[model samples]
Target: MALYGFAQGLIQEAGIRIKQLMEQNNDLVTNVDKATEDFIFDTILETYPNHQVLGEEGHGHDIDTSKGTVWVVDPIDGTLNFVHQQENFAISIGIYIDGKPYAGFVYDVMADVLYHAKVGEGAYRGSQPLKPLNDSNLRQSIIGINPNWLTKPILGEIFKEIVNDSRSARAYGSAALEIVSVATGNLEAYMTPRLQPWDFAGGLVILYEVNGQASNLLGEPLTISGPNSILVGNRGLHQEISNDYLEPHHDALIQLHEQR
Candidate 1:
């Protein structure tokens, strides 16, 4: 409980820096990103000095995840949006105990919406508990995806059918926010060919708490150990998408593995 509150405070405090950068018409986004990460890292360490910390601005990447407590953080998940739009970015954090999901948080700073979950408990917005997501067929659902992928190499060709089959497509710019969209049922599913650990860590946990299925394009469980492809949705959509859309493209999925 205290940890949740502390994390909330830290994320909101980080937003102050983001807001300051937004006021200026500059790409000072990285400066704020690094600073917010530094402050969050230091603040977390002060309270839990022995815990391992993995941060987007460079913290604990090579550490063993199976060890004690670990924190994964992305000070700002949508750097492009932060620099240009300023509203779609977010602060994301996931706390792991013994390499397992313990809790997660995604704070949409501009909108003042903080999405969170404790493992096996439930996902929430503010004090409201978000209901579990319901499954839907691709042709009847609106999914979140980067539109540019439709014409790009590898996934561009691969996702063409999936895009055409879905009811519609939307791009939100922030992986964390998009994942939150899935958890909240605002989006039926979301995918990207590549993402860092910090980018999906927090949102993945929230998704799980609300019964969302998350995995790689090839049906492997996601890990905070490194970067990986992402495919997440309600139960039925996941199975349907994986079997119908992703299975036939085995070679393409392996090629997009993006080992980092």
Candidate 2:
């Protein structure tokens, strides 16, 4: 409870900083990104001195994630979107205790929607509990992914038929918010070539809380250790996509995973 309380205020503080920068028409996206991460990191250390932090802006990435309380932070989850579109970016945080997911928070900064979830409890948006996701197959569902991935040499071939089979596809530049979209039942499934742990860490907790699923593109369980290709959806949809679309390309999957 103490951790959650502290983190709630922490998230709010982080949101305000981003909002202020957005107001000032800040063009220094990279510097602003790192500075925001530092602000979050410094505030965290000021209170929780013993907790380890893994952040997108040059924080601990190689520490033993399986050992202790680690705070995984993505100060700005969609840097390009933050810089180019000034919307759709989010602040994502996932707390792991003894290497297991404890609490997760994701704030869609411009949209002003905050998503949070805890182990055993349900996920929420602005304090309203999110319902379980609707189960559906790919042919009848809207999936989330960058269409550009469909233009790549190897992955394009693998994803081509899947995209064709889907009812439609959408690509919101932020992987963090796209994962939130899947969790919120706005998208039936979502996948991408590579995502760092910070990209999916918090969103995965929110997804799991609502009976959604997550795995590497090869159907492997995702860990917080490093970057991974990710696929997430409701139970049946994930199985269908993995079995029907992804599993057939085992060799390609292996090669792609190595590429990431």
Candidate 3:
């Protein structure tokens, strides 16, 4: 409970700091990302010196999810959005104990809303508890998918079929925000070709609480310290989509990713 409280408070504080920085510089760069990450890393270390951290800015200890408690952070989840629009970006943090999720937070910095969850404690939007997602078929669901995937040769072929089957499609540049949309029932599903652990770590915990599912494109468990293709959705839709659309082309997608 103490750790969860600390995580919630810390993420809110970090969000405020990010907005302040945006007001001053407005232009996004690696330094801004590093500064935000550094602040988070320093604060975490000061509060819990023995805890391990893995951040996008590369400012902390080496990632080893096999042992101790680990904090996975992405100081700014949507750098492109932050650089251009100064909105839609987020601060994401996930806490893991012995490689299992403990607590997670995704703060929409500009909007001042937080999506958070603790294992077995349920998920929340701000202070409101999110309801469990209801099952829906692909034909009636709106999916979050990058347009780029629709243009690629290998992935595009399969994704085009998904697009045709789904109710409609939308894309948000931020992975954290997209995942939260699913948790909130605003999006039926979200998929991406590649995402780092920090990108989906926080969102994964929140999704799990609402009976949402998250896994690699191949329908495999996500590694806590590596990159993988991601697919997140409510339980029924996730299984149906994977079995119908993603599974057949799974090997091709893997080969395509390896070639890249």
Candidate 4:
């Protein structure tokens, strides 16, 4: 917990520095990305000396992902959004001991919201504990989907399912932000076909703490080190969406995978 908290403090400090840079112009190459990542990398290495660090920007020591403690970080999760929209971006951080997340944090720097969680403990936003998420009826739920769902052949079916079942949907530019939305109850559910560890790590902890669920599109547990192809919401909503939508399309995805 101490190490996780230390990491969060570093991210929070980075957020403040980024806020100042936002006034300058928007670009993926903004000073915040480099400066914040460098600061965190330096501090982490100086503190641990042996632990590995993996950051989005090229700052930390390269890691094997199979051993020791690895800190996976997305200095800015929505670089395009941060560059152009000035919002919807996040600093995503996840720490894994061996191969499991010991803790994670996703900070929406612009909004000053911190979404975090630790394994087996609980997820949280600021000081408030998140409540368990519940949704038996897909029709009443609001889902977060990616814009690419409209065109991707495989996700098209998933999109159709969401459209036919949910109240409505939205696509936030940031994966970390969208995941937190579901955990915070702003959105009943969130889904995507692909993501890296850093993209969903912090949100995973937050959602799990709130009695929410997360998994691959096939309803399988998400692995901490792999390239995950699907990401879905917490427990109740997960079952609802999977049984009502994804199950029927499972075979199609299998065939699609085989062809590839």
Candidate 5:
């Protein structure tokens, strides 16, 4: 509980700094990303020097998920959004104890809304507790996915069926925020062909606490050391999408795997 509180405060502090940068009319730069990451890294090191930290800016030490606490952070989850729209971006952080998820946080920088959870604890959006996700059939579900999934190639063609079957589809540009939507029951599912650990690290724990499911496209566990193809949704929807849409296209799935 103490660790969770510290993380919550630290992420909000980071969010405030990002907002200050935007308020000054500063354009997005690699330096801003590095600075934010450095601040987070320093804050963590001050309190937990032995903890392993990983950040998108490459400022932290190498990750050793086998032992000790690991902090996975994406100081800016949507650089494109930050550069182009100044919104829809987020600060994402996840804490793993001895390689297992212990707590996670995703903060929408412009919106000032925070989504967070600890393992075995309920997920929350700001101060409000999120309800467990209810099942929704594909025909009635609103999925979050990029439009490219419909036309890219092997995987694209295969995922088009999901787009066509769903009640609607939308893309928010930020994986962390999209995952938060799933946790809040606003989006029934969100899938992507590629993402790094920081992208889904925080959102994964929040989603799990709300009864949402997350895994690779092949229905495998996700690790903190690399990129992965992700499928996230409520239990039933996740199974339905996997079995009905993804499974039948086994060859295409293989093609994606090989291409990756």
Candidate 6:
């Protein structure tokens, strides 16, 4: 609650500022983005000077997983959404204490919705609590993924297999939003070919609260520092999706990565 509450106030302030600026000019340059990012980073540093921070606007030191207590902050996730749609963008924050994510917050500032989670506590949106995810199978599931991942070479093939099994798929262009959708059971699963710690931090906490699984592409646990390919789902569906869709193309993706 401490982390979420703090994030809530900060993000709300940012939203108001963004709305006013965006209404004046739809364009977003480095300056506009950096201004917001710096404001958030400075506040965090002031409040938690002992902790290290990584912000998307290129502030802060390089990620040192060894630091043990690091905060990953994306002042705005879905900058395109903010620039184009003027909605759907979010402020994403992940807190890792001792190399483990203890808490996360994804605040959809325009929508005024906050998705949050902690290690043991369940995820939440405002005052309502989320329940554990329990879905039957992919055919009945709503999946979220990047459209690019569905069309790119080796990863595309793998995604096609998942789509074949799934009832339907959608892409929201916001990592935090996609993950939060799963947490709320609005989408049964969310898949991505790659992600940064900040991208998944807040969403991971909320998903855990609702008994959703977040893992690497190989079905391994997600680590804080490394680049990762990920899949998240409501309970049994992760294994089901992996077994039916991902295993056969694993070697192909590995070889493609090597070639690149």
Model 3 lDDT-worst window of ten: 58-67
What C-alpha lDDT do the candidate models reach, one value each?
A: 0.87, 0.89, 0.90, 0.77, 0.89, 0.79
Q: What TM-score, over all chains together, does every model reach?
A: 0.95, 0.97, 0.96, 0.89, 0.96, 0.91
lDDT of 5 by residue, 1-260 (tens): 88888999999999999888768864455767888999999999998899888888774545576588889999999888888898899999999988889999999989999999999989999999999999989889999999877778677777888898999999999999999999999999999989988999999999989889998888877888778999999888999999999878877776777689
lDDT of each residue in 1-260, candidate 3, tens digit only: 99999999999998898888777864355767888888888988998999898888774545687568899999999999988888999999999999889998999999999999999999999999999999999999999999988898888989999999999999999999999999999999999989988899899999999999998888988877688989999998999899999999878977976865
Which is the better candidate, 4 or 5, if ranked by TM-score? 5
lDDT score, candidate 4 = 0.77
Instruction: Give per-residue CA lDDT, model 2, range 1-260, as digits (tens).
Output: 88988887788788888889778865578876888889989998898888899999879868888777898989998888888898889999999999999999999988888999988999999899999997898989999989899999889988998999999999988888888999999999999988899999889999999999999889999989888899999999899999989999989889867766
Residues 1-260, candidate 4: write the lDDT tens digits: 68977987888988887887666544345667888788778888898988787777754434576588888888898888887777878998888888766887899888898888888877788877777776646777778887677687876866786777788888888888888898888888887777877788777777777777788777778865565655556566678788877878889866654554
Residue 111 of model 2 has an lDDT of 83
- Model 4 ranges with Cα > 4 A deviation: 24-31, 58-62, 255-260
Whole-model alpha-carbon lDDT for candidate 5: 0.89
Per-candidate RMSD vs. true structure?
A: 1.7, 1.1, 1.4, 2.3, 1.4, 2.0
- Which candidate model has the greater lDDT, 2 or 4? 2
* Better TM-score candidate (2, 4): 2
What is the TM-score of candidate 6? 0.91
Q: What's the true lDDT of residue 259 in model 6?
A: 53
Q: What are the per-residue Cα lDDT tens digits for candidate 1 across 127-195?
A: 799998887999898888898778787778789989989999999899999999999999999998888
**Clashes in model 1: which pairs?**
none
Candidate 6 Cα deviation (angstroms), residue 259: 5.5
* Top-lDDT structure, candidate number: 3
Highest TM-score scorer: 2
